[PDB]
């Protein structure tokens, strides 16, 4: 049975950080690509990025849209994939998947985690 | 920058009934290489996780009712739902994996 779970989310200020954790299990971590998709409240699904498997050599990839400020690494002993998020639009559900190049897609999906942002 | 237009934004139909949804792509999403079209479609209910539908145009992911059906190539797809079921409400993306990913804007579905 597949699993991912992502924690870290609540309540911050632009500029500030925070660490969005992936937790895995079901499958050979390694083996899969593992991107970082979000979604801010009633709106699209917005892929960030993600970092390619054991074969690929482990190498990141980003959108223009978060590349710099947002990082993203994983643990091969632990399978628990991270999303170090660094400095309004930021806002929103943040969903962990499994992916890779044998389907082209996301096959899997965490229960996201809510990040908001309030003075 | 790859841009993928789905039309209509949302639509409506009473449960049993058939319907289909457009995806295009600013740009061809067909590998000559292994001649696979590196799109997908995703169903997202109303405060759920996304999931996957379709890969690669045409393929059906396991478990999926084949009532779902996907479809076209290069920059033109269609997602067809033959005799929609009450859990079928919900957004369906596409997206272009053919650089990187990409999502389009969803279409959302409801049933009255
Ligand atoms: O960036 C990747 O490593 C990846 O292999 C992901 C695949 O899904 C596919 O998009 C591929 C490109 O199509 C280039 O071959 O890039
Ligand atoms: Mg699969």
């Known amino acids: 049975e597949v699993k991912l779970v992502e924690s870290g989310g609540g309540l911050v200020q632009p500029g500030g950080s925070l660490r969005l954790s992936c937790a895995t299990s079901?499958?050979?971590?390694?083996?899969?690509?593992m991107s970082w998709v979000r979604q801010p409240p009633g709106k699209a699904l917005e892929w960030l990025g993600f970092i390619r498997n054991k074969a690929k050599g482990y190498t990141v990839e980003y959108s223009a849209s978060v590349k710099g400020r947002f990082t993203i690494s994983r643990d091969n002993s632990q399978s628990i994939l991270y999303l170090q998020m660094n400095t309004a639009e930021d806002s929103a559900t943040y969903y962990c998947?499994?992916?890779?190049?044998?389907?082209?897609?996301?096959?899997?999906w965490g229960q996201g985690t809510s990040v908001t942002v309030s003075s | 920058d790859i841009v993928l237009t789905q039309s209509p934004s949302s639509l409506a139909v009473s449960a049993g009934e058939r319907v289909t949804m457009s995806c295009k792509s600013s740009?061809?999403?067909?590998?000559?290489?292994?001649?696979?079209?590196?799109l997908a479609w995703y169903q997202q209910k109303p405060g759920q996780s996304p999931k996957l539908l379709i890969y690669?145009?045409?393929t059906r992911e396991s478990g999926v009712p084949d009532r779902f059906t996907g479809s076209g190539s290069g920059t033109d797809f269609t997602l067809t739902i033959n005799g929609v079921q009450a859990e079928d409400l919900a957004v369906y993306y596409c997206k272009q994996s053919y650089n990187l990913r990409t999502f389009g804007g969803g279409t959302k579905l409801e049933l009255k």
């Open positions: 998947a499994r992916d890779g190049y044998y389907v082209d897609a996301m096959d899997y």
């Open positions: 690669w145009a045409s």
């Open positions: 740009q061809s999403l067909f590998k000559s290489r292994n001649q696979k079209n590196y």
């Open positions: 079901g499958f050979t971590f390694t083996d899969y690509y």
